[PDB]
Design an enzyme around this catalytic site. Structure first.
Site, short mmCIF file in Angstrom:
data_model
loop_
_atom_site.label_atom_id
_atom_site.label_comp_id
_atom_site.label_asym_id
_atom_site.label_seq_id
_atom_site.Cartn_x
_atom_site.Cartn_y
_atom_site.Cartn_z
N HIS A 41 0.81 -1.21 0.00
CA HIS A 41 0.00 0.00 0.00
C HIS A 41 0.85 1.27 0.00
CE1 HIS A 41 0.15 -0.48 4.59
NE2 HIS A 41 0.56 0.77 4.41
N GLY A 143 2.69 5.85 10.53
CA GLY A 143 4.05 5.84 10.04
C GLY A 143 4.84 4.59 10.38
N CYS A 145 4.04 1.50 9.50
CA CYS A 145 3.88 0.43 8.53
C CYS A 145 5.22 0.06 7.91
CB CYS A 145 2.89 0.84 7.45
SG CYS A 145 1.25 0.94 8.13
C1 LIG Z 1 0.15 5.77 3.43
N1 LIG Z 1 0.59 5.31 4.76
C2 LIG Z 1 -0.24 4.57 5.53
C3 LIG Z 1 0.13 4.12 6.76
C4 LIG Z 1 -0.80 3.31 7.57
C5 LIG Z 1 -1.82 2.59 6.95
C6 LIG Z 1 -2.73 1.82 7.68
C7 LIG Z 1 -3.80 1.06 6.98
C8 LIG Z 1 -3.48 0.21 5.93
C9 LIG Z 1 -4.47 -0.50 5.28
CL1 LIG Z 1 -4.05 -1.54 3.97
C10 LIG Z 1 -5.79 -0.37 5.68
F1 LIG Z 1 -6.74 -1.08 5.03
C11 LIG Z 1 -6.13 0.46 6.73
O1 LIG Z 1 -7.45 0.55 7.10
C12 LIG Z 1 -7.79 0.43 8.49
C13 LIG Z 1 -9.21 -0.04 8.63
C14 LIG Z 1 -10.27 0.84 8.76
C15 LIG Z 1 -11.57 0.38 8.89
C16 LIG Z 1 -11.83 -0.97 8.88
C17 LIG Z 1 -10.80 -1.87 8.75
C18 LIG Z 1 -9.51 -1.40 8.62
CL2 LIG Z 1 -8.22 -2.58 8.47
C19 LIG Z 1 -5.13 1.17 7.38
C20 LIG Z 1 -2.63 1.74 9.07
O2 LIG Z 1 -3.39 1.09 9.78
N2 LIG Z 1 -1.58 2.50 9.69
C21 LIG Z 1 -1.43 2.39 11.12
C22 LIG Z 1 -1.66 3.45 11.97
C23 LIG Z 1 -1.48 3.27 13.33
C24 LIG Z 1 -1.07 2.04 13.79
N3 LIG Z 1 -0.82 1.01 12.98
C25 LIG Z 1 -1.00 1.19 11.66
C26 LIG Z 1 -0.68 3.27 8.96
C27 LIG Z 1 1.46 4.46 7.27
O3 LIG Z 1 1.93 4.12 8.35
N4 LIG Z 1 2.24 5.22 6.42
C28 LIG Z 1 1.85 5.66 5.18
O4 LIG Z 1 2.60 6.33 4.48
#
Ligand SMILES: Cn1cc(-c2cc(-c3cc(Cl)c(F)c(OCc4ccccc4Cl)c3)c(=O)n(-c3cccnc3)c2)c(=O)[nH]c1=O
Ligand SMILES: Cn1cc(-c2cc(-c3cc(Cl)c(F)c(OCc4ccccc4Cl)c3)c(=O)n(-c3cccnc3)c2)c(=O)[nH]c1=O
Lengths: 305, 305
Positions: A41, A143, A145
């Site tokens: 992603h 951040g 991920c």
């Molecule tokens: C672009 N981008 C994105 C992220 C990033 C993406 C995510 C993330 C990734 C995917 Cl595929 C998701 F489907 C998603 O929907 C969450 C959700 C909502 C509703 C129902 C079910 C679900 Cl599952 C979330 C994330 O959860 N986090 C995160 C935050 C806090 C703690 N842990 C994880 C971070 C990142 O860190 N950096 C960066 O540049």
């Protein structure tokens, strides 16, 4: 003396952490040999996350749309491919700090260390268990991920986890390093249930052995049980059933302490039915299930790497 | 999301760990620039430990009686001196992996990461607090002496602890990197009491703020208290008195959450007087006191190094 939730030394993984940028999105990648691994992603915008077509999105990206920095060492991307939910970027330079390593898919109930990272820079290290429902109870902010989980076996790092997302319930989900999710999860912002979770019985038993070794002994009693009788109690309290394979894995600890596995089961049965009566075990007022039998032996024997 | 007992990434310290041998005794040393630091009891035999005269024992040792290995890189010892309870060996080679560093003497109630080592090889990493009575509740086996505790501030490692001994009660005692013990302890096998310990009030409060941030909120109530009223409760339950300086240190967390410090004190007062009623806070059935206000902010903000 003492018993702590202990992580593996993280130095060998720190030297592999890089920052991956695609367009507006930046997250963490893992640089091993001449390949960088990160969540696919990285190619998404916020609007793409609800129903992304990852094949279509990746087709619009070229090698030069990926920027990879290891500290201030800029890596040149010379190829890209998608494997399940991970992106693999081929770079023109082999990481000189690549440790001996392998990719492993761990079993539920096993533990591993997580090196939490932000923008490619390591932040902290902690231990955790793959839950029976294939979530992990981590500590992750936006951040994080692409942060990875691992075990270290002397000189060999076994990478078992890459962090992808937090569910609406606040628990965490991710993949192995081939990009296959643990559990039923998909990398899409859509409703996703995690299974009913359960307590990892063989780990609780291992931790009770650790407690006896360290002098916490008040929960030992004069009762015993059978595998079948104990499992009736396990089911009532939402503990995983104990199997003979689990009994066998506890063999070394039984041998060291002289406490038969089924006698320790009798102690655990009484703790489940009666609680702790305001007492603690190894500094905890709950029954701890994120130490495996291997963990206990390593920490109670002093294995190094 | 989530809250874990998180250690600093240990890579920068791993590259400084060496094995120091003097005669029959081997333990861990810390190689920074062209100096190796280790506990001075490396020069003792088992018989010496009851009433050692360290000046006399060190006089019988020459440079060539110290062997120092960093992996399989043998270091040549060209000088030795004793500073308080630490030995400093001058070697002919500066450690090429020396990080930016300083030596710090920490205050009681502060936290740090420990890199537990055996025969110079890192084994695991965990977080812990300097207790108010200047012990630490670590995880140490025979051979762990010379393992170090540290904090990392971006690129700078602040070394604050070197492990020297386990007391008969099973708790751990050590020195700063100038060789001065924390607490009343001496490096002699003789009866030594540790002070009455107490719970680190400002840390418990910080952890309650961490819990609210993560959605654990059931302990918030409609009551308030005064600094003086709360401290009457603190004294009854063997908590450290809360001072205005402690209130000020909690200022940032109060500002982020909108919960006045004295209102959180009112929550803590009710938890002390009534217990948890079978509930948990951040996965714990006890009140946790080994997270500082800085720790909570770092983990709830994502600071990296
Ligand atoms: C672009 N981008 C994105 C992220 C990033 C993406 C995510 C993330 C990734 C995917 Cl595929 C998701 F489907 C998603 O929907 C969450 C959700 C909502 C509703 C129902 C079910 C679900 Cl599952 C979330 C994330 O959860 N986090 C995160 C935050 C806090 C703690 N842990 C994880 C971070 C990142 O860190 N950096 C960066 O540049
Ligand atoms: C030669 N040698 C020695 C050690 C080593 C030494 C000690 C140790 C060091 C000093 Cl100065 C002591 F006064 C001491 O008396 C303990 C004691 C007994 C009775 C009353 C008060 C006290 Cl304080 C013990 C130790 O406690 N441990 C240890 C073990 C388990 C966990 N943590 C620490 C290890 C080592 O690791 N390697 C190595 O080569």
């Amino acid at each position: 003396s003492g018993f702590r939730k202990m992580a593996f030394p993280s130095g060998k993984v720190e030297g592999c952490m890089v920052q991956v940028t695609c367009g507006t999105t930046t997250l963490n990648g893992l640089w091993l040999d001449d390949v960088v691994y990160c969540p696919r992603h990285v190619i998404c915008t916020s609007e793409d996350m609800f129903n992304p077509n990852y094949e279509d999105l990746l087709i619009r990206k070229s090698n030069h749309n990926f920027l990879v920095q290891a500290g201030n060492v800029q890596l040149r991307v010379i190829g890209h491919s998608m494997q399940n939910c991970v992106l693999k970027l081929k770079v023109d330079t082999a990481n000189p700090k690549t440790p001996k390593y392998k990719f492993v898919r761990i079993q539920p109930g096993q533990t591993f260390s997580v090196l939490a990272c932000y923008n490619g820079s390591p932040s902290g290290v902690y231990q955790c268990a793959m839950r029976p429902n294939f979530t992990i109870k981590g500590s992750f902010l936006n951040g994080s991920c692409g942060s990875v989980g691992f075990n270290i076996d002397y000189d060999c790092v076994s990478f078992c986890y890459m962090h992808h997302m937090v569910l609406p319930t606040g628990v965490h989900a991710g993949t192995d390093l081939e990009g296959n999710f643990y559990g039923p999860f998909v990398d899409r912002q859509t409703a996703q249930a995690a299974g009913t979770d359960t307590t990892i019985t063989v780990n609780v038993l291992a931790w009770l052995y650790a407690a006896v070794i360290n002098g916490d002994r008040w929960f030992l009693n004069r009762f015993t049980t059978t595998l079948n009788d104990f499992n009736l109690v396990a089911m009532k309290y939402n503990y995983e059933p104990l199997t003979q394979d689990h009994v066998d894995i506890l063999g070394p600890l039984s041998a060291q302490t002289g406490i038969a596995v089924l006698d320790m089961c009798a102690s655990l049965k009484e703790l489940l039915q009666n609680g702790m009566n305001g007492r603690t075990i190894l500094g905890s007022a709950l029954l701890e299930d994120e130490f495996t039998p291997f963990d206990v032996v390593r920490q109670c024997s002093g294995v190094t790497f």
